[PDB]
């Protein structure tokens, strides 16, 4: 069966060719697209064919691309007439990624990182044929096959018990046979993430006489359930324990669906693998009748319901009390039951629709036509609102392909930064072939930058012990249906990857003298590498490295120690590239750090708030490994201020006088300053509402441009002053030692920001829930998920929350806080 739905899959998934052929350019464009987030005049230098000197002008940055196209073509040419609009691109310069032309200028990440950072803006003008396109598709990537490498009852008039015998354990190890005595199982059965009744638990038994390698139960399994109250996505839950003979240690787990792919419920032996990591077989053996059941889906009712009564004797202030409530987090019992009977006039919000269906009473057989009917007159969520229809708690296949029909509403660029926890949405499908992995598989087909992430968010998911089968067979279904070219440069990609992490070992285990020269020497492997191959940067693809410079490689000093990796790009109109390569770190948490910051970045520019944050890039290459973004010309502020030591002459200019040395105009400091004032903003709210603490001076960089910004993200989600103000940046927030009203608008920000990302608390949170399954220290339970709810305060109105931030603000100040009338 399981074959049969591997089998499935891969013919559904030619059908989803079909639909993105390779003469399609929009679906198969062969290059990166330039990021675009939705959002005066800055001037563009643009290189033409035919000219030696790149044109420079003046654009608005609410122009599109189209228009700036068409404007450097009127400067060459006087009639546009003769030459074809059509057919000529603008991409940046030393980057293979292509701008949108229906967006702005503005929008595009690209520019707003050069502005920001006053880098120039480069591009370069030039036609379709001229632009590198070696990672589209071909005819023969569409015509080639995926590859990943009688009687019937039905269920609800089904009366048989859930029952099946737990026979063996085949294959257990030595050491397995040194520690422990006895062994036995324990069975939960769960929908919705939820037990539907309590475990049960086998027998303690030892290896079977002459098979030290089998463990033998023997033994039947009776549930207090009958087959007719299993709802669809019923799964058993096999737990191996193990009693140590000198507590009960944890071995291994298994899942079986109750139902599969087919809707037939398993019936006869299934074997399934509990892996040590090393492959125990397990075998349940399952009523086998001379018949199968199929689960049926209640029949349909169809129903318009818009003309009831309205009595709203303070009942409808208390619903909209409920409907404009942030999440569902911690809603009363009784505000659920009710509701769950106002639910049919709550249809005019439809974002409330997660909340009705976590208020249900149960998922029984009978309830289902009524939420069914609701259902489908609900009208069309916002997709960040569908997200929490993609977590554990909805199992019903309903539920969620709705919601992921509602979800295909988001543009590719949102959706790249949301990859994370769809990878881990994942999960909560029971089979192979689901509505969500075909949408994640069409966006890949659609988009080199959504496959290119999914690849290696995907390579990171492989590690998990449960579940890395099922991302092994996403991650075949991905690299088949992506093409020749893309998965060459996957391959490079690896291969360069692996390189590195070699060298970063090698330069950990040598000490003193020899790390330095082992590193030049380790090296040599890379450049051959390059001798061979021109390779794109895993962390950003649209840069291109032929060639590694040696010279400029070295290691930065720390507790795991980095590699600088410099290479030279393959465009001479580009710049050289320049990444942090660590071994010996976990960087998934980091990773999720920098993608909460980057979405309070989004929802702040969204309302037009714009903080001027840092927002670097890093990327879980391997397990425990990685490649990190480099911000050029920044320090620590250990750093900063021991360097200002060697003078001493004030505790509160070490910032002030670095930032001057680096911009030493009395604009050019105001400039620096006001980055400071607004970065430190941003990272102040990021850091209360995370939990981010041990902000130590070694975890504080800051930019010479000014800006503030995060490195380590070691406390995350962390228990306990909120942040920390010191006098010297107070300092550069006042511009003098007494306070101005430049700390009023820096106060300003923060409360401003803060309620901000207070509006999109559900959004928050339920991100946080979807990467609960992935495994990371701090975030294992919803608890972890109620501190950040707790420091986002939905119940307070944005003037109380204010006040708030605002002794916040007081108590980081602390005994330079005398100074200020808050
Ligand atoms: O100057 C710098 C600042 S060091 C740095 N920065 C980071 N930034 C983001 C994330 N983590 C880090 C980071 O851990 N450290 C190391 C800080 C440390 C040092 C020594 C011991 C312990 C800790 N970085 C560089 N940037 C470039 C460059 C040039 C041109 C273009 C470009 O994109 C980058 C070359 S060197």
Redesign the pocket.
Known sequence: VQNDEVAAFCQSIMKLKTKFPYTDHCTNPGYLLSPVTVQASVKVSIEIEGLQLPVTFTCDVSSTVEIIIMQALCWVHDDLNQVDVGSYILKVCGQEEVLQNNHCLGSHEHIQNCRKWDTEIKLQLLTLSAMCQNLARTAEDDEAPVDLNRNIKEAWTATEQLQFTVYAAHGISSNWVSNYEKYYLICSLSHNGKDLFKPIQSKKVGTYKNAAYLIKWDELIIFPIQISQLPLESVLHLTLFGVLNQGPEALGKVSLTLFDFKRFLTCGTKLAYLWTSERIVLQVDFPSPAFDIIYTSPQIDRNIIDKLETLESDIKGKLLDIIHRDSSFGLSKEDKVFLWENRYYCLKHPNCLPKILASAPNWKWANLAKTYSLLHQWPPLCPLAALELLDAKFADQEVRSLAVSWMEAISDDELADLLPQFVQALKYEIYLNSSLVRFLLSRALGNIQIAHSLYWLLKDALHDTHFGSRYEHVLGALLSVGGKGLREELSKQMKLVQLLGGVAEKVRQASGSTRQVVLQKSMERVQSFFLRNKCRLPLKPSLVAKELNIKSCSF???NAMPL?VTMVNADPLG?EI?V?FKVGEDLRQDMLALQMIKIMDKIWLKEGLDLRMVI?RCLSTGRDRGM?????????LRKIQVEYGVTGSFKDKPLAEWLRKYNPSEEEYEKASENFIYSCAGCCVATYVLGICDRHN?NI?LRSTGHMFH?DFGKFLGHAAPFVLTSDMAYVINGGEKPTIRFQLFVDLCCQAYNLIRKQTNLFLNLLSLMIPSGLPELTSIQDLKYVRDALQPQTTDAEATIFFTRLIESSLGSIATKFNF
Do not use: C, G, Q, R
């Open positions: 930065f000093s720390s600088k710049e320049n942090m670097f990190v973004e480099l911000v050029p010309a920044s320090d620590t070694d960089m490195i």
